[PDB]
Design a protein around this ligand. Structure first.
Ligand SMILES: CC(C)C[C@H](NC(=O)[C@@H](O)CC(=O)O)C(=O)NCCCCNC(N)=[NH2+]
Length: 208
């Protein structure tokens, strides 16, 4: 497969977003991969609604956390997801409003655990969600360069891998542009379960 890929360079990734002070990383990462597969398939780049998920996804827990599988499953079950414009983000949970089904997906697949080759194969197809230990201070204060740790493998933050180079993953965070490299962080590729456990629980939506 390609030595390097960057979906941002292919117009598959929307501008960086800020989940603000609400534990919704499960929504932002999930929605981003949806926005991505949709553009890759339809040629349309559309910003989708995290808030919808936050409000209408019982299986997950609004600002109190969530999981990849359920998010995807929701979007699928619900028959589609609405745009960022009609259902803006509020950084605080609320009653499920009715929403327009702008974008739809057919399924989602898991990438084999702690297998960075498989993950490379997946990212080469389309951006993917991953869980990382984002609890270390070094990571939280990461500003630039190829981050190589330290960070454990305790899964607590959800992000997206939008591309890669020979020795690092191009990760998209949901903390705005004033964190890392204009919102992104280049995480070294170290095999095993990966840096901060980045290769522990990867996934990507599917659209036929
Ligand atoms: C695996 C990734 C997505 C971490 C995830 N935590 C979150 O969603 C966030 O707090 C992420 C964030 O940056 O806000 C998580 O696993 N949290 C657990 C929440 C459990 C929900 N509460 C229960 N058990 N009812």
């Amino acid at each position: 497969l390609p030595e390097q890929i960057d979906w941002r360079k292919k117009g598959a990734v929307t501008p960086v977003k800020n989940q603000g002070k609400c534990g919704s990383c499960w929504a932002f990462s999930t929605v981003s991969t949806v926005e991505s597969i949709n553009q890759i398939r339809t040629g349309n780049l559309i910003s989708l609604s995290e808030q919808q998920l936050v409000d209408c996804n019982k299986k997950n827990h609004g600002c109190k956390g969530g999981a990849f599988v359920y998010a995807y499953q929701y979007i699928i079950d619900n028959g589609g997801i609405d745009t960022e414009a009609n259902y803006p983000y509020k950084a605080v949970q609320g009653p499920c409003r009715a929403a327009k089904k702008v974008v739809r997906i057919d399924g989602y697949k898991g990438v084999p655990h702690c297998n960075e080759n498989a993950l490379k194969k997946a990212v080469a197809s389309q951006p993917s969600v991953v869980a990382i230990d984002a609890s270390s201070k070094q990571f939280q204060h990461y500003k630039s360069g190829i981050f190589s740790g330290p960070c454990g493998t305790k899964l607590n933050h959800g992000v997206v891998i939008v591309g890669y180079w020979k020795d690092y993953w191009i990760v998209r965070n949901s903390w705005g542009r004033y964190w890392g490299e204009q919102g992104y962080i280049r995480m070294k590729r170290v095999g095993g379960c990966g840096l901060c456990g980045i290769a522990r629980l990867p996934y990507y939506p599917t659209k036929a």
